[PDB]
RNA sequence: CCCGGGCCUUGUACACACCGCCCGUCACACCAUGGGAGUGGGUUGCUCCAGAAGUAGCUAGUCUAACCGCAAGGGGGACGGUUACCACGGAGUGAUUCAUGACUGGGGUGAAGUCGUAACAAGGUAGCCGUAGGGGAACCUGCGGCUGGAUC
RNA sequence: AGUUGGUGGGGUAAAGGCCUACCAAGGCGACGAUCCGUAACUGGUCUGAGAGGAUGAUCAGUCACACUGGAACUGAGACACGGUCCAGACUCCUACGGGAGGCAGCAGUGGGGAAUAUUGGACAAUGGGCGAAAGCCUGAUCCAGCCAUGCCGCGUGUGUGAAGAAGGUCUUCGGAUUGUAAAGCACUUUAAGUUGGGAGGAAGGGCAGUAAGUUAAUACCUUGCUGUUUUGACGUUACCAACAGAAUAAGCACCGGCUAACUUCGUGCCAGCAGCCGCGGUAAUACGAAGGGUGCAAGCGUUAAUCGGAAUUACUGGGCGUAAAGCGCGCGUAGGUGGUUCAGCAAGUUGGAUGUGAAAUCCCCGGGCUCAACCUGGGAACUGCAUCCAAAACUACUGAGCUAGAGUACGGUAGAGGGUGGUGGAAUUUCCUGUGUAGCGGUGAAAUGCGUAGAUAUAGGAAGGAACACCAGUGGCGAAGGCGACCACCUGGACUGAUACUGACACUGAGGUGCGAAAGCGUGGGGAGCAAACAGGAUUAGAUACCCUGGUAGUCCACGCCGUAAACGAUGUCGACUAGCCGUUGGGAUCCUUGAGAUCUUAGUGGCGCAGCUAACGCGAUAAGUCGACCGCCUGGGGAGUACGGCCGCAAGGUUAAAACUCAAAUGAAUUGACGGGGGCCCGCACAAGCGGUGGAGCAUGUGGUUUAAUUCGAAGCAACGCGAAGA
RNA sequence: GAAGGUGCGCCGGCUAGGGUGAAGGAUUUACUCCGUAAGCUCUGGCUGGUCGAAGAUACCAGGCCGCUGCGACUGUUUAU
């Protein structure tokens, strides 16, 4: 705090790791899905969420959410990863974008559609 | 010990605390010098040197409704960190009422005369 | 004194309110990570070898328009040779970094399984700190210290 | 180790270890050298109230590079993108002997990627090169092709229009909402389409004439005018008129709170949503759909990234008693800061001037595109640097002083301050002897144990070790850790009174160094009691414990090491100020000279308490109040004071000190309740004293279980079981 | 001696110092001290040239490195 004390030392400002590494400072990345399946919640929540390993493009292995009612991906598919985590998915950092590559958009979805990807009808 | 400056200040601070009426402590010319710009910008009614070869430095302080007339003093430059600053920058205590003593080397004298007379300098304290 | 109840005060890590809370080992799963005989790359230090072209020095020599000249030939030059510098490449020996590695250690998260019940009330041996020894485990014991201990 | 200087010489356009010969041992570095990782730099750009933080696209200045490494040549200028030589990798041609190339120029291709465009026209303009000029080249440049990529501007119609049309949705079944919204009636038609007209970006060149200059010349040539002919890539121009018809033009996100905007239907902890809180387990404003609404609009959302919010690195502008944070404690180096008076100086400081701080951008006032985006005129600014001139309040320096801080000289006082040696008493244990006889010891009770070989007890004697009862006291001393028997010796500090002396000699303190409980470690001694480990006895479901009986290290001493504690007042050191009241230790002064108290003052040590502070608890002259100097430390919890490396250590370990991952909280204080194998008080067939019972027997009833075709259903501790059932 | 590397012959040019040492001087005291040109002798430094395939040319004269078991180590022992 003292003036004499700083001046030595200056303050330091601490840099905060992205919380989406594998994506390196790009805003989506291309990635092939090596195994797709379902996991269960944390405490509060109950459910059968469609998450999928993909081997990005730079190397990286992660695991993205499937949002959306049904997919068609399975494995050696090609798909586009976002970011953003999802909070009662442990160790799930992004999210995969529907209606790119190779995953469809949910079909018959009629609100929100261009945040999954559906067509106008 | 290494600011009689700042003693001065604490020591009025303190006693409009206490309800004193006049403080006393050794005396110097920044100490009777800072105290002539505060007796005549009416923040203290009066102060008198002692002459002798220990000379102290004597306040009468001043209450309008037992309020002390001195809001607060807060002391600017400090031996530590020793603050300077040009006609334009002087600062403005409280948009103006209050005084931000500069010694300037037309002598020590008040922010607003600082700027009648574009001169800068040190800025001792803050007064309200 | 046993049970239940009423008031005051006290301690509480409880508020689902002690039929509470909560600790650790062990069993299973997942995740990240340390150690690890090694294994495979990147970069780099040092000590040397090497020396293409080029530049400069010297001259085994060969050739030669400007100048001089008797018109012999000199002056100068070119090439050749050679030395100095030095790139590539090579040798040895280190350093560092990245990735992997049988096995091994702890850590975290788990839908909850086994063994106890260590702490929270004087938590039923007050607790905690340092240290030493011991024990399936929380822990226990000794020595010193503290109150961040109840009753009095 | 050409490393750093010197000398001579060489070399450069030029100084210089630039090179060389010799001489000397120098040079840089906690003000961060060297090394590792990253990176072009700046004007500027983003964000921010600002200070700051992030960043270095377009444009501009500098730099470096040209397939990789190196080298020179020419030239004013290069060690040269589209130049030369050599070596290397790649591609290609070959007659096998050898050759050719370098799109990080403009297009374009393959590849990588989430992702970024035409194999376009012209030198018309402005520049550049050459040329006397004409003129040539110019993928510079000027334009055009593609892309909502961004900023800006416009449109997708306007008024009227209840039938409150139909349909949809909800519904209370009345109705409401979609909704003047549609339909209809009138109307205009930006923009798009078609047609027509239509600037400017053009400066100039050629030709001919004329005038002037020049020269001996009227010739040639140069310049100024006159007339004519010619130069626009774009472009099929901006811009302007006419025709036609609402005709060619609305989608995206959201509606639980943050946050503007809600119902129904389907699903039912599944499907799913989700930035956080969180929603969904059968009546969901949070999921999917519909209607309605909300916000935005040729755009709308999501992601990625920066700043802000974040005062959440606090200079502006935070904290450290208990929430994270005062080093265990001294001394002290660099540094930081320093009492008071006089004089000088002018580095800081202040004002002014000058030069510079490139242009563009930011900002202010204007001008031109129909406005805006955009362009542009001028100004402001660039908070900086350098020089000069003035000033001397403060800082720095210099010179001279002063005693208020600091210190020295003297007498005295108290003290478990420290070290070295002796000495004493009480007690324990062990051993010897006498008396004396069934227990002693231990526990909740026991048992292990000791004892008839005579224990315990009692008396006498001896040895040995450890600690010093009473005094004893929020008493004393010490920097802290710590220090309690007495005496002798050696020795530090503090307190106290006056006088005398120095005269700021001070404070703090990164590194550094010294001391540092207990445990522990090494060598040697010593060993009475106690007692980790260990053994046995109990308790317990178990008891590697609590309890008991023994008992080793250790505890003790000397010399070394360690270097840690809840090393705490969880409160760094130093200095000053701010009501009081009640104790106590060592002094001093005055009244009391009192015999024996009282009043001031000082250094400590405690308890209340005004103000003030604090989140509260509380602190409150021994501050956590008001300040000042310096230092150390903190930035959510866990991982973790851990791993790795370094230093230290004999070791145990200490010290310095991360990250990945993971969680949305951990945390402090205080309040209400509840609880306690906490405390105080009180009550009830709760206990105590008794009366009679159940549980043992036979019968009645109900329940569970079993069985059945059903043994109908419910009631499930007290508070269900002769209950609903007051009667199959 | 970890490992590993460079130089090394001969003949010139220049150059730096040891020792010894008539003189001379001193103590011209004496088996005295200082010192000394030349001459002998020893150790270097910097350069140039030159021959050979090769210069520590013969004889002479360590091979080295990595992991691991055992014994700490020098030593002693089954004369055969
Ligand atoms: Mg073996
Ligand atoms: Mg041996
Ligand atoms: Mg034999």
Known sequence: ATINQLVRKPRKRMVDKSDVPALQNCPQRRGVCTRVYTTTPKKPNSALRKVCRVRLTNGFEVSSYIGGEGHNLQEHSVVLIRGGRVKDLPGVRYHTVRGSLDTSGVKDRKQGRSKYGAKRP | ?128
């Open chain 2, 1 to 128: 010990m290494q600011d009689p400056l700042a003693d001065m200040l604490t020591r009025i601070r303190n006693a409009q605390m206490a309800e004193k009426t006049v403080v006393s402590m050794p005396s110097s010319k920044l100490k009777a010098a800072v105290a002539k710009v505060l007796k005549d910008e009416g923040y203290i009614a009066d102060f008198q040197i002692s002459s002798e070869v220990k000379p102290q430095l004597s306040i009468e302080l001043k209450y309008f409704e037992g309020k002390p007339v001195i809001e607060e003093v807060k002391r600017i430059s400090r031996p530590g960190l020793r603050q300077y600053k040009s006609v334009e920058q002087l600062p403005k205590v409280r948009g103006g009422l209050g005084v931000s003593i500069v010694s300037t080397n037309k002598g020590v004298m008040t922010d607003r005369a600082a700027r009648a007379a574009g001169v800068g300098g040190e800025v001792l304290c803050t007064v309200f």
